[PDB]
Ligand binder design. Structure first.
Ligand code: MNM
Ligand code: MNM
Ligand code: MNM
Ligand code: CL
Ligand code: CL
Ligand code: CL
Lengths: 655, 650, 650
C-alpha cells in the first residue's frame, strides 16, 4: 500500500489480462515494432513479455540497452505493461535458456547481467514483473558441468543417509532427485535475491513447464517464499503428449489446477500458451484453432488465472522457430487466433468485477500426485517410455480420474500431496483420489488415517502404497496401509494391456490395465469377482470410508479410451453433499467438460463440447436458472439443458 | 557329505531370499511352508554386502540364522558365492574389476567357504550366479590386460594357408577362455577350503549366450551343471504357448553341456513380473507342472524356483515369489508341491530317468553365432539379424516336438564323432553358417559310417575365419555331392514349389540353387535345382540351401518341416521311438526310460482337447500322471488344453 | 584412348582381386567377361595387397590381373585405394594424419609409375566413393584443416540488416575439403601420368549431394562417375520406381558432368545376402532397364559391382554377376545383350544426346543444409525430416516420368543463368527452402526473358543463413507478385480442392495461404488463396506454397501433379517432345537423339500390359529394342511388365 508505490502489484483481486510475447532481436525496425504494439493494444491485450537477451545487450568489451529501450518505450506509448524475463547470454541455438550456471565464473557473469539489466529496466513505469528464469527445470540436468557437480557433492556431504532403514532392510535414498529439488529451490531463490539487491518494487514471477513430466523437479510450496506470482508454460505442441488433441481441454484444465495448487495463497497466471503454428518445432505439432484459443483462455480464467500470455505475438526470424508460433500473419495482421484472443480481452473490460474476483468452485475432490511416486517409478521401470511399466503411468493414472470427472462436469483439484492441507478437524464431504501413487511413507499414511477418521473419502486404485519413499515395499515387509484399508494385498498377476474386472454381483465390468490385484479383508467389506477372488473393498474408518481396488482401473479407462465406467463408479462413491451443492452433468458425456466458479457470491459454469456432434447437456446440482453470458457458436438453454456445438465454449451465469 | 550323481533322487526347491530387516519369525514361516510343499532344497545368495562389517571383517549371523532354520526343517542349501556388489546390481558381476577386486573376492571365498562348509545341510557351492553377460567389460583394466596377454600368446595371421584374407575372432575366442579361467579359478579357490561339497554353476539366457560357454571344459572342475531358464528373460524367441518347446530345448542344451555330469535347473520362474522381465508373465499352475516334468524327463536332478519369497526393496520388490504377500501358497506353490509329492511316491522311477535318445541330434556351434554377429553387423529382429543361427535349429526342434520325437540340442564339440557306426543316427545342421575343415572331416566320417545328415539354410557358407569356400572352392562339395550356384534374396516368407506332386515348403528370405555331381537333384516348378540327396558310404545327406526351418518359424507352421524330416529318418527311429501318427500343432511329446521301463511325457498347448495317436516303441499305455483326467483308448491319448500327461508303457 | 562425348559406350564390371585367387580362376573371369561383350573392368588397387613388410611395393598380384585383362583386350579403370583396415569396405575418404598423407603420396608414386606403363589402362579412379555422412572431425588431419579454414574465413553472427544468422561453417568447409582432397589426388597422379583419364564415383547422391561441388571437380577430371546401387542409394523409392531413381541419379551426374562425359562407375550386379540397406538380387529385366536409362542419359559406360565376389567376411559371395561355378547368371546374360546391341549399332550408341524437354528440376546444397538445422536430424522423407528437400524435387521428377517427359535434375549452380532468352524453358523449385538474393536475381532474369517458374512447398522460406525473409520482408515478393500469409500444419496427407473444380491436389503436412498484389489469385473451395500465376516480363510464375510434390509422394499418386504441371508447360514443349497422351502410373519414357535421328526409351513397371499413346515430336514408331515382344500400331506402344523398349522415330 506504501512499499507498493507506483508499480501495480499483482493480487488475487487483480483484473485478469490477455497478452503475448513481443519477440525482440537485432535487425527489427522501429516501424515493425510499433506495428506489433499498436495491433496488440487494438486486440484488447494489456501485457507483453520480453526475453531480455544478454546476447543482444553485451558489447565487444559493457551493457548497451538500446534494443530493449526502443521496445519498452513503444510498449509504454501503447499503455502495455512488460513481463521482463532474465535471460543471460547463451548460444543463439539455445532456444529455452540454461537452467543453472555452468561454473563459478559463469555465476559471476549472471550476477553482473542481473545488476546491469535490473538497475536499468526497473526505472520504466510500464514494468509489471521480473521473470526470474525462463522455464526452470529440464529432463537432462547437467551433472557433468563443474558448478552442478560441486553443488551435488557438497549436498551429499551435508546429508547423512544410511543404506538401511530403521527395521534393517536395504533402501534407496534418491539423493539425485532430492538434491535436484533443493537445487531448483536454491537457484530460483538466489535469482530472486539478486533481483532484490536492485529492485524491491516489482513482482517476481517464474514459468514451470512440461508439468506432467517435470513436476518431480518442482517444490512449489518453497517457491512461494520468494515469488509474488506463479506462472507456467502450457503448450499444446510440447506438454500434452499424454492426451489426444480433442482432450487438450482436459490437459489445460489439469495444467491450470496443478499450477493453482502450487500457487497456494499466491496468484497465478499462464506465462506461455501456444499462439501459432508449428512448422519444424514442437513434439505434437499443430496450429491452434480460434476455438482452441477461446477454450484455453476460459479454462485458465475459470481456474483463477490472472493472465494468459501467448508465445508469441510476432515470430523469431532466423533458424529455430523462424516464422513459427505467431498470432500475427506474415503481413503483421491478425490471424483468426488473435481475433479470438481479442474477444476475450474485450469480454474482460466489459465484465471487470466478475473477471477480477474469480474463485474456482472446489467440489471437495482432490486428485493427489507426489514427487516420490514419480521417482520410484523412474527407478523401477529403468526409464522405458510408452503404460504401467513405463515413465508417466504415475501421472497418466490421476489424469485419467481427472478426465473421468471432467466428462461428469465435476471440478477436481490436482495437487502435490504436500500442497494438500492435512491439518483440519473435519473432512466430511472431502474426497482424496490416490490413483497409482506407488510411493507413500509412514508420515503421509498417518495424514491419510487422520483425513478418513475425520470424515474424508479415500479412493485408491493401481499400485498406490506398494512402496515407501525409499522404494521399500511394505506389501512385502508388513503393509503400512493395512490399518487404513482394513485389508492386505495377496497377489499381483500381470495380464494383457487391457482386461476386464468382472464383479460377482450385477454382471458389472471395469476396464483394467496390465496387473490384476487380489486382497484379503480383515475389517473392510470384501468385493468379489466372478472367479471368486477378492479384487476390492470398502473400509468404514471413523467417520470416513476407503475404497481400494489394487488393479489400475484409471489406466484401464485410459487404455480403453472410455471413462464412462470410471465416471459412474467415482460418482457412486462421492458424498451426497458434493452432488447436491455442485453443478455437474445428469450423466457421463464423452468429450464434454464443465468446471464451475464463483465471483462475489454469483456462481458460473464453463462448458466446452469437444465431440463431433451437437450435445444437449442436462446440468443438475447447485441452484439457479442458466443464463448464457458467453457462447461463440449460438448455444441455447431450455431450463438447465444446454445445447452446445462442436468446439463451442459456453459461460453460464446462475441467476 | 552327500554328492549328486545320475542316480540321485530328483528334488523340487526354491530360492530363499535373505537380506537384513527380515525377522526370525518370517524366515521360519518360509522354511516351514517350503518343507510342507514337498521341497527338499533351497538356494541362498551369500551376499558379501550383508556379511562385511565396517572394519572389513566378516559377520556370518544373518546367514547362520537361515542355515540353522534350513537344518531344523531338513532342507539342504545351494550356497551361491556372491561377493560385495552394488545393491542395484541384480545379477552380480561376471569378472573381477581389477587385481585389487580379485583379492577381495579371494578373501570373500576364504571367509564364506571356511565358515559355511561346516553346516551338515550344505549341498553345493554355486561358483558364481549366472556366468556370462552380453556386455563384457573390455574397458575395465583387469579384462583389458588379460585380453592383451591372450592376443600376444596366440599367433594369428591375416591370411589362411591358401593366401585369402581371414577374420580370427580374437575377442570371441578370448571370451571363451576368460569364462573357462574365472570359473576354474573360483572352483580352485573353493577347493582350498572345501573338497567335500559339489561345485555347481547356472549358465543363463542360453539361446543368446551359448557362444560364451565351453561346457566340455567346465566339466573338468564342476560336479553338476545348472541353468537359469526364465520364461520372462530367456524365451524371447518363442511365444508363450511354445514355452514347452523353449524349456525342452533349454533342458537339452544343458544336458548336452553336462555330458557325464548330472545337471539340474538352478532357476525357474516362480512368480509374477510387476516391473521386471523382458516378456513379463505370472506363470500358471499348469506351466509350473509343464516345466518340472519337461526338466525331469530331460534328466534334471532338480528344479529350483526363483523365488520362494520376494526381495523387499527396489528391483523385483514383491516380484517372482511362489508365496503370496501373507506368506501362504499361490496356485504355483500348490502345483510344485504335487510334483515333490509324486517324486516321494515314485522314488525308484524318478531317480533313474534316462532320456530316450531318438538318435536325432540338432547341432549348433559357437562359430556360426560369431560369424553371424560379424555379417549382420548386429541388426536385431530374421536371417539378416543376430539369432537366426539359433532360431533355425530351434525351429527344427519345435517341428520334431510337434511330431512327438525327442531331439538332442548340442554344441558340435559335445557330439561324439569317434564311434565306428552311426547307422540310424541323424544330425541336423540348420543354418549353421560356419563349418571348418576339421568338423567337415568329422561329418564325412559320420555319414560314411551310416549317419543321416540334414542341412538347410546357409549351413557351411563360411569357415571359422568367415572365409566362404562357396566362393574359393566349396569344402562340403565331397560330402554334399553338389555345389551352390546362387542365393537370390526374396520376401521374408516365400514358397519352394517342388516339381513332384505340386508340393510346397515355406522358406525364409533367401532361395538357394545348386548343381549336383554325385547327388540326386530335386527340382522346383521353375526348373531350378533347390535340394539334393547324396548317398555317401553307408549314410545319406539331404541338402536344401534355402532356410526352410526359418520359413516354418516365419509362417508359424511346422507341419511341412515335420512331414519332410520324418520322410528322411531311418525306419529304426520311427519303429523304436514312440511319436505321433502325424504332426500336431502345439502338442509336444518326449520319451524316457527308468530301469527297463519306457515312459512318455505329453503336453497339449493348443486351445482345444486333442486326440494324439501314439505309434512306435512297444507296450500298452497306463496313465500314471494327468492333471486334467486325460484318458486313452488303445494308444490314442485324449488330452486337455494345458494338461501334462505321463504314460507308463507296460 | 581418352574418353569424350563421342566415345562408344561400354558395359563392364569390377574384377575383384585379393590374395589366394589362382591364375586359373582370374583367367576364367576375364575370358567370360570378354565373351559377355564387356570391354572394360575396374580394379581396386589395394595398398594392403602390394605393401611388403619392409614398406617396398610388390605389384605381382595386380600385374597378374592387368596381364590377363590385356590378353583378353579388356581395359582397366584402376582405383587408387591405399592401405586401410580389411573391415573398411568403402575406403577412407580423407587422410587420418600428415604421416598418413605421406603414405598416400608414396602409394600413388609407386602404383601410378608402375601401372601407367600398361597399354590397357583406361583411367585412374582418384578415390573410391568420395564423401561420407560422418566426416572424421576428431582425427588430427581433418581437425587441423577445419581450424585453418575457419581462420581464413571471416563470418559475423549478424547479416547486413542486423538479424542473427547461421553461417554453416561445417557444411561450407566440407565442400571445400572434398574439392581440396580430390584436386590434390589429381595433382599427385599428374606428377607421374598426364596420359590417362581421371575419374571419380560420387555415391548415395540423393543424401550426399550436399558434399559435392561438381562444377569445381570438372577443373581436374576427364569424366564424372557414380555409384548408383539399388540396395544402398534408392531408399527414397519403392523397387517398382528404381527406374525413376536411376533416371534421376543419371540426370544428377550428367548435370554435375557439364561439358565432361560421364559414366556409371558402379551398378548393382548381384545378390545381397547380409549386405545392403534395401537388399535385392536385381532381375535380368532390371539390368536391361538400368543400362538403357543410363545410355539414354548420355552415359559412356555402365560398370557392375561386381563381376566376381569377395571371398571373406563383408560381402563374401555377394554382388557377383557370375554364379559360384564362375558361369553367367541371368544378370550377366542380360548385360551381354546390351554390349552386343552396342557393337551392332556403334554410330547410334556413340552419339547419344538426351532430348532436353527444357524442364530443369533444381536442388541446392543450402536447402539441404538449412533442412538439417531446422529438423534437428529427424528421419525418413516426411516434411519435418532430413531428405524432404530431395524427395520433393524427386516427386516432380517421377510425375514427369509418368507423363513420358524428360527433366534435368541439377544443382542450382549447374544451371546456366547467363542466356538472353528462356522462352519455352521451365525451372521447378519444389521445397527448395533456402534461396539467397543472388539466386533470386538470377530467377527474376530467367522469368523476365520468357522462363516458366513452378515453385511448391516452402521454396524460398529461408535464405542461405537460415534467416526467413518470409518474416523480415519476403525476397520473392517482386517475382511472385504475392506474399505468404500463413502456414497451418495439417495431417500427413490432405486435399487442396481448387474453386474451379479443375483440380484436387494431394498435399503434405502444411497448408500455405497467400495474398496476391500483381499475381492472379487461385482460390480453394474453402475460399482461401492457396496459389497464384504471376506474368513477369515474357515469362510466368506458378506458386503453390503447400507441398504438392510431397503430397503426391505421400499419396503414391502422381496423376494430379502430372496434369497440373502439363497444363503449365509452354505449348512448344508438348508439340516438340514425345510424351504420353495422359499420365500412366508406373510407366516411364525419356527421349534422345543420335546425329539427327530421334529415339524414345519406354519401361513398363506396372503389373499389367500397358498401351501407351505417344504424342508430340514427329515420325512413325519403329521398335529397335524390346526384350518381351512389344508391338506398336501407329504411335500406340503395347509394352509388357518389366519390358524395356527403344523406339526409333522414322
Ligand atoms: O517453443 C516455443 C517457446 C516455448 N518456450 C518459450 O520460453 C520459448 O523458449 C520457446 O521458443
Ligand atoms: O530376475 C530374477 C532372477 C533371475 N536371476 C537370478 O540369479 C537373480 O539374480 C534374479 O533376481
Ligand atoms: O557394397 C558394394 C560395393 C559398393 N561400393 C564399392 O566401391 C565397394 O566398396 C562395395 O563393395
Ligand atoms: Cl521470455
Ligand atoms: Cl543365488
Ligand atoms: Cl574399386
Amino acid at each position: 500500500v506504501l512499499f507498493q508505490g507506483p508499480a501495480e502489484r499483482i493480487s488475487k483481486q487483480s483484473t485478469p489480462f490477455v497478452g503475448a510475447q513481443i519477440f525482440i532481436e537485432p535487425g527489427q525496425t522501429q516501424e515493425q515494432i510499433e506495428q506489433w504494439f499498436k495491433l496488440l493494444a487494438e486486440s484488447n491485450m494489456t501485457t507483453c513479455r520480453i526475453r531480455m537477451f544478454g546476447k543482444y545487450m553485451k558489447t565487444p568489451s559493457t551493457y548497451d540497452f538500446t534494443l530493449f529501450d526502443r521496445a519498452f518505450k513503444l510498449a509504454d506509448k501503447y499503455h502495455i505493461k512488460v513481463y521482463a524475463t532474465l535471460f543471460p547470454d547463451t548460444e543463439f541455438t539455445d532456444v529455452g535458456g540454461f537452467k543453472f550456471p555452468h561454473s563459478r565464473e559463469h555465476q559471476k557473469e549472471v550476477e553482473d547481467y542481473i545488476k546491469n539489466v535490473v538497475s536499468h529496466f526497473s526505472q520504466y513505469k510500464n514494468l509489471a514483473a521480473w521473470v526470474l528464469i525462463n522455464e526452470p527445470g529440464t529432463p537432462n540436468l547437467p551433472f557433468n558441468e563443474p558448478f552442478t557437480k560441486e553443488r551435488f557433492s557438497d549436498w551429499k556431504k551435508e546429508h547423512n543417509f544410511s543404506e538401511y532403514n530403521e527395521k534393517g532392510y536395504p533402501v534407496l535414498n534418491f539423493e539425485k532427485e532430492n538434491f535436484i529439488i533443493d537445487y531448483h529451490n536454491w537457484y530460483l531463490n538466489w535469482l530472486a535475491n539478486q533481483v532484490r539487491l536492485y529492485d524491491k518494487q516489482h513482482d517476481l514471477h517464474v514459468n514451470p513447464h512440461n508439468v506432467f513430466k517435470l513436476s518431480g523437479l518442482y517444490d512449489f510450496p518453497t517457491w512461494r517464499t520468494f515469488l509474488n506470482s506463479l506462472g507456467g508454460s502450457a503448450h499444446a505442441s510440447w506438454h500434452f503428449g499424454y492426451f489426444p488433441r480433442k482432450a487438450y481441454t482436459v490437459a489445460m484444465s489439469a495444467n491450470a489446477e496443478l499450477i493453482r495448487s502450487g500457487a497456494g495463497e499466491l496468484p497465478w497466471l499462464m506465462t506461455e500458451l501456444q499462439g501459432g503454428n508449428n512448422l519444424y518445432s514442437g513434439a505434437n505439432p499443430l496450429c491452434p484453432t480460434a476455438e482452441e484459443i477461446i477454450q484455453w483462455l476460459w479454462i485458465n480464467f475459470a481456474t483463477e488465472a490472472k493472465g494468459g500470455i501467448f508465445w508469441s505475438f510476432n515470430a523469431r526470424s532466423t533458424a529455430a522457430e523462424a516464422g513459427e508460433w505467431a498470432m500475427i500473419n506474415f503481413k503483421n495482421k491478425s490471424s483468426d487466433r488473435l481475433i479470438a484472443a481479442a474477444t476475450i480481452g474485450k469480454f474482460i473490460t466489459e465484465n471487470v468485477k466478475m473477471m477480477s474476483n474469480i474463485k474456482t468452485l472446489n467440489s471437495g475432490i482432490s486428485i493427489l500426485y507426489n514427487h516420490e511416486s514419480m521417482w520410484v517409478e523412474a527407478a523401477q521401470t529403468r526409464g522405458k517410455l510408452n503404460n504401467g511399466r513405463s515413465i508417466g503411468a504415475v501421472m497418466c493414472s490421476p489424469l485419467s480420474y481427472f478426465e473421468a470427472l471432467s466428462e461428469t462436469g465435476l471440478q477436481a483439484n490436482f495437487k502435490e500431496i504436500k500442497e494438500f492441507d492435512f491439518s483440519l478437524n473435519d473432512y466430511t464431504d472431502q474426497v482424496i483420489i490416490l490413483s497409482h501413487q506407488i510411493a507413500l511413507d509412514n508420515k503421509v499414511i498417518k495424514q491419510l488415517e487422520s483425513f478418513v477418521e475425520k470424515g474424508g473419502t479415500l479412493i485408491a486404485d493401481g499400485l498406490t502404497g506398494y512402496y515407501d519413499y525409499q522404494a521399500h515395499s511394505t506389501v512385502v515387509s508388513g503393509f503400512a496401509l493395512e490399518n487404513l484399508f482394513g485389508s492386505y494385498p495377496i497377489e499381483y498377476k500381470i495380464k494383457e494391456n487391457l482386461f476386464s474386472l468382472d464383479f460377482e454381483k450385477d454382471n458389472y465390468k471395469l476396464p483394467a490395465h496390465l496387473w490384476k490385484g487380489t486382497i484379503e479383508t480383515s475389517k473392510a467389506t470384501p468385493i468379489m469377482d466372478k472367479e471368486g477372488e477378492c479384487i476390492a473393498c470398502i473400509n468404514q474408518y471413523g467417520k470416513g470410508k476407503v475404497f481400494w481396488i489394487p488393479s489400475p482401473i484409471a489406466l484401464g479407462a485410459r487404455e480403453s479410451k472410455d471413462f464412462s465406467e470410471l465416471s459412474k463408479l467415482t460418482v457412486s462413491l462421492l458424498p451426497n453433499k458434493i452432488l447436491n451443492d455442485n453443478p455437474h452433468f445428469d450423466k457421463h458425456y464423452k468429450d464434454v467438460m464443465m468446471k464451475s466458479f464463483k465471483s462475489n457470491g454469483t456462481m458460473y459454469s464453463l462448458i466446452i463440447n469437444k465431440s463431433a456432434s451437437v450435445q444437449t447437456v442436462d446440468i443438475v446440482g447447485g441452484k439457479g436458472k442458466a443464463f448464457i453470458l458467453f457462447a461463440n457458436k449460438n448455444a441455447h438453454s431450455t431450463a438447465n439443458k444446454l445445447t452446445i456445438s462442436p468446439e463451442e465454449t459456453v459461460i453460464i451465469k446462475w441467476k
